[PDB]
């Protein structure tokens, strides 16, 4: 239940740009306390502000 920080969002965006989205476990590996699913969901949100 940890809120997302701007630094996390930026890291998330760059991690996806460099690695792609075929493996969310790779992306999550670099975001402490964030799982693959949490990273995919956040990414979808940052792409289109709900």
Q: Which is nearer to Na ion, 20 or 37 (CB)?
A: 37
> Rounded distance, CA 29 to CA 39, Å?
10
Q: Which stretch binds Na ion (CB under 5 A): 6-14, 18-26, 30-38, 42-50?
A: 30-38
* DSSP classification of residue 22: S
Instruction: Give phi and psi for 41, each to the nearest 5.
Output: -60, -45
- Alpha-carbon dihedral angle through residues 7, 9, 10, 12, given to the nearest 10 degrees: 120
Q: Is 15 in the site for Na ion (CB under 5 A)?
A: no
Q: Is 28 in the site for Na ion (CB under 5 A)?
A: yes
Q: Is 16 in the site for Na ion (CB under 5 A)?
A: no
* One residue of 1, 34, 37, 38 binding Na ion per CB under 5 A: 34
């Amino acid at each position: 239940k940890t809120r997302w920080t701007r630094e996390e969002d930026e890291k998330l965006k760059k991690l996806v740009e460099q690695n792609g989205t075929d493996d969310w476990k790779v992306i999550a590996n670099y975001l402490p306390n964030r799982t693959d699913v949490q990273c995919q969901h956040r990414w979808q949100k940052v792409l289109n502000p709900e």
